[PDB]
Design a protein around this ligand. Sequence first.
Ligand SMILES: [F-]
Ligand SMILES: [F-]
Ligand code: NI
Ligand code: NI
Ligand code: NI
Ligand code: NI
Lengths: 122, 570, 570, 100, 100, 100
Amino acid sequence: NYIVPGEYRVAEGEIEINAGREKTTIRVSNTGDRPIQVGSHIHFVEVNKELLFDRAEGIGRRLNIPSGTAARFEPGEEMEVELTELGGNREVFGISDLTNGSVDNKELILQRAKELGYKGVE
Amino acid sequence: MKINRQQYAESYGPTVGDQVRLADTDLWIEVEKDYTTYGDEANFGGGKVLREGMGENGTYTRTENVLDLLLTNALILDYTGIYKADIGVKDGYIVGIGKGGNPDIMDGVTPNMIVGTATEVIAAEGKIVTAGGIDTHVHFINPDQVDVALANGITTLFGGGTGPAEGSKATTVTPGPWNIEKMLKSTEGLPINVGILGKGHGSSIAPIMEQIDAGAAGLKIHEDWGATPASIDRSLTVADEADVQVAIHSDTLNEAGFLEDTLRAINGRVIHSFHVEGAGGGHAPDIMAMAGHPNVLPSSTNPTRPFTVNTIDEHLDMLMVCHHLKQNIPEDVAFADSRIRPETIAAEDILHDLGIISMMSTDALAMGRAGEMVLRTWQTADKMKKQRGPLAEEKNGSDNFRAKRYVSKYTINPAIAQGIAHEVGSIEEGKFADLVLWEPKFFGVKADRVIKGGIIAYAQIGDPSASIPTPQPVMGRRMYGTVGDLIHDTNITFMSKSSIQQGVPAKLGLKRRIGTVKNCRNIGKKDMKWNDVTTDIDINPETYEVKVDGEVLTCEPVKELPMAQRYFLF
Amino acid sequence: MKINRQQYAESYGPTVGDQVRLADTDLWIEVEKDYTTYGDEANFGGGKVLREGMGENGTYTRTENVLDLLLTNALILDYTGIYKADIGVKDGYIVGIGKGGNPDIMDGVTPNMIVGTATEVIAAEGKIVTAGGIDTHVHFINPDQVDVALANGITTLFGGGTGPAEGSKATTVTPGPWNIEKMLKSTEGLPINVGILGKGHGSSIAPIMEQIDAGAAGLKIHEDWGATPASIDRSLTVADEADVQVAIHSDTLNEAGFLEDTLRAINGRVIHSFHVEGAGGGHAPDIMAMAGHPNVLPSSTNPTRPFTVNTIDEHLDMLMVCHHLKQNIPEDVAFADSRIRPETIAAEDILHDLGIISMMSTDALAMGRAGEMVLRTWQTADKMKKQRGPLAEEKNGSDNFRAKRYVSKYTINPAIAQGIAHEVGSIEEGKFADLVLWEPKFFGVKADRVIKGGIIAYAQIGDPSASIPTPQPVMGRRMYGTVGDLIHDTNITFMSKSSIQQGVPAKLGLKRRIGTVKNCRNIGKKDMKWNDVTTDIDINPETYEVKVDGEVLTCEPVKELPMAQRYFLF
Amino acid sequence: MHLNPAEKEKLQIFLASELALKRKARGLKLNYPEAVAIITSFIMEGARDGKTVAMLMEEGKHVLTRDDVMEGVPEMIDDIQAEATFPDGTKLVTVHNPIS
Amino acid sequence: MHLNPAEKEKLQIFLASELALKRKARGLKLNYPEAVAIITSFIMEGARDGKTVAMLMEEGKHVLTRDDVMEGVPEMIDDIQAEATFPDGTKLVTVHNPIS
Amino acid sequence: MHLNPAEKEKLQIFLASELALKRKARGLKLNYPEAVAIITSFIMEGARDGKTVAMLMEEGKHVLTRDDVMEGVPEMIDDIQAEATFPDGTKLVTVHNPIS
Ligand SMILES: [F-]
Ligand SMILES: [F-]
Ligand code: NI
Ligand code: NI
Ligand code: NI
Ligand code: NI
């Protein structure tokens, strides 16, 4: 009976994000001495050079977290994160300039990443 | 990875099946569908999604499917639906309703809704977004009335007047070519859309028609200038030739005819019946029967909306002032008293709820309140839910049917009636980006931000000296869309086809966008969205009892309304 | 006939060697030189000197060395000196600084400073006169912010925004050709100089460059749009071609790189680092190290200026609102908290005092106060005198060195950084006559009269119904320079060379004076007047301790400031 | 607060009434604008209190008497009109001949 | 007086608070703008008194309680923000959830 | 009410004086605009009371003393000027050095 002006009455259930897309869990470490925070929609292979992880496993992917949230790595901190697949045309331009085209070009992306010192290229 | 619904709605606004209370009313709207792809919602800010290479595309130039403005996560309330979408604006118009962002990486992006370098962002998550209100019964009496209207979500003013002259204080009339030209030039400084009505009075065609050619967008027939069979007839002959609308305030006195005589003079032609209940004017006591006819587009003005315990007592002195009447002339008082009837006011509530009265309007400053058209629409809907129950058409416990029926009364239907719905009156692709954001707690009471032609024109915002815009005092203020020459690009002056063809804008130096009035004469009650009912309305001449389908229409006045003392400082 | 110094200063303002207290601070400025000839001082009024045949020449036409306006007996405070002179204005520009009057009978008249029939007089005896403030960090959020700025002596606003849209509430960005055109047209009604920044984001050149060609005067790189290596690089490539400045708010999150990665993307090119201390944004915790580099033009925004006991406590909620962050997202709070550090705020005070941070700015309405750039500059200088002592460079017990260093931060240096110092930013012959008069008791607090292009635009003045203008209430009010079409001639819209060459002003119907942005890419820290220091700034990533030349920079917060509760009603 | 244009304007009626009440309290006969302000603010506060329009139309005739105001003021005020938010929304109160 | 734009605007917060306080004193449950005005003026007068920002962030939660205001008003006010001149210059006070 | 531009503006002097008087009553030393507001409103109410210009030119020097105001405020106020409607029309009151 009490009226909260403008209140919501939400439906039952839950919302599944990024439904139907492959998910991948990887370990990532901040080898730097300042904190690194990573948003939900950055192409994961293009994050800060000083994050150490299997860079190939970030290609064509991003964090599987709610839109507009982030994962925070304090200095020296290692965490497991879950990635989802990029959608749409599966192309990335700009950011760190590692892709500039289809994410399918894994060898080129990794060659650029290695030459520029992004940690974790095999 | 799943998110519960409470947290989802907090972060992105509600989604399918969620309900939202309208202000402090009992009315609940339910999200019918959602254009998003869950996980790819657009949002802007520090570390958020609309960033270069991410939700913002870094490749395309403005002309390549990129927006000037994206409203993210809007809950749209419109005659077309109640639903969740992003809204994309370009060149001052709504170009996309759907899902915005970056096709590079997001699923489900509407192809012409790319967020690019050229794109500004307004966050609509947690807001209700409606079309700007279309007020077709405006007396231009005091320029301070514009901000009053903007603050309650009105974005178009149709009517007439030259300021506080007695003719204008009584009638929505800007008379003759010279007054029309002067007011078209005044309009260059009014931060709202405008159309001007000429005097629908005369017994020869040329004095009436020359107002249309001078730039009027329609005509007003008003009893204070003689709402005679001749003036009715000549005005409609002009309107049929010029493709503009005629509004009527009929002969309350029944001096030259009764209602049936006015209808015979109309002779089946299209007309907009103002304040059809009749307190604001018209054949006493039975004018409201006009709302049953297929050629009548019927509106109410707002002081009778809805029926409350104080409604009757305010009206006599209001009417006497408006119409320049004298307390010491008994027949002036008798005329005023003849217009004020609880029986027809009560029935007017029900006729709105049944879709028999199709439109709301203010009657600003001449028996009406410039900033209460939207407000009183929702108070009426709430009263009718309380007294009549959910409409039979509703489902899942929502009030969506009633919400569509009522929002149409002050958005799309006045636009259709006036011949301007190709430009304004609804949230649809291809229409001008006149949009109102509301916090649900303030819905219908005080607008958050009023967008005009794609730029914010009015906003409730705080201390201009502060570190951020939210500290007190938060008040309604004109924004950059109203400043300098931007007032020209964010507002439309609506004009007749003939005045446009004859070059009136260039002659007068008008810089505002010029809107064409058209498709006014080939419509009827059937074209009023969600409010298309024709029926035989019987009004007893002795008792004023109103019958439809053999049933008396009556309801009680209420002592209290929502959207009232919880909100207002005075 | 001799006059004692106290009486001389009362009558004509101070002369060589006299000192004046700045407001209620401990800062004293000393007159370094005086251009007058004692006995031939100009003054205006009943029975005074500037009368025909006397101090006013009656022979010469306006074009014959006669002024439109003489400011008599000004105490100039400028990067060029602190000194006593008359100031002569003609065609809206400063044409002479020296001694005005009539060569017929007076000694020492500067040849082009004749008071003639064409000359208006402003009495500056007993006033301090400075250049108008140049605020290069303005968010265009609420038009009411203009008078706030004028009242504290600001005459140019550089920044971006479209009103209270979330993009603009976070970032100094007017995005894309259409929003830029709309805001250039809005600017026609803003009584202050303006330049507009486009969105410095993209991975292709054309979406960024088309903003410059549309009329932008520079670019803003902001982390809320993705301050990535790509966006940094493309924006600087555009700026190097177009000869405009780029401002940066860097990647606080260190998401795509640390500070060293941002510097590598800049690659030695010129850039204006906004809020270099970092509370207002940037690589946490070490962004302020940018102020050591030769290619960086570093500014502060004002809420951290100076370090006080309440500074930290206000910042978290301010930041969350500005950047559209959510209290219920832990990483949003962690990001906000990472920006707020007493260690770097305290060091920021000292870096200003050492000439390592070259500029002040507001950040108006997006973590900054539109009317407190000048105010907080002097509060900082006063705090530093109290805590660090007179600077070693001072003499005769004056604070002239510190006064020059600090006045430069909000006048000449922002103008140089933006490429507009050929027009504005100092009291020098050949520059636009944007001048602020201050009573010493109100210096830096409330301007007396603000002159724009040679006409008073804003003044603290009293009752408009009174017999004289001094009776209460004395308040800030817009003057005739802001009215009618005079707003066009008294203000400058600054634009890129390409937009000017491509005829954008004529295309949009802009009537304001058009200023060209130029000479932005061939400057560095060495060109910042009195604030040209380059050094290696070390910021400890763990403790946030700031070191320069092996010494920790720290100071205490203060409980009280001058230029505060003695003056303000709220 | 979300003040709209009318809320801002009507604050200055309340203020003028407070001014006029302090003048009355120190013994002055009130002038035309003072008398109008007092009666107007009385109406708007009565609406806030939840009185009816009909109550205020009558109470407004008993707020000030002719001995409270200067010569001629009763005859200068033919009526006072004010709108305020009642429990049932905005309504207009017209007080005819408030001071006999 | 040399009033600047903010000083002029903020006078109307003080006035709205005085209005609201008189309504509370005669027994009315306060509405949304009344409650905001009272808490806002309280903050700005506290700054004038020389309290700290941190003091006012907490005191602002104890100015009005839910029994002082109409139904739903506590839930309508997520926070109140006000800037005023403290002894150490202008600062922002944010009071979260001022009425439980 | 028929308020003209000056009547509207001068309401805000009265309001600023009321604000300043409440600050003084709770023990604060008054600042520059507060002191000016109090003395100005005093003059305009004195005219309303029917005092002469000459009376107010002298009384205005005895409204506030230096112990009522912050350091330096007496020396910041060289004079206060106000116009108001006296029984014989609008006149100007100039108070020189109102606070010694
Ligand atoms: F009407
Ligand atoms: F910023
Ligand atoms: Ni009518
Ligand atoms: Ni009407
Ligand atoms: Ni920033
Ligand atoms: Ni900023």
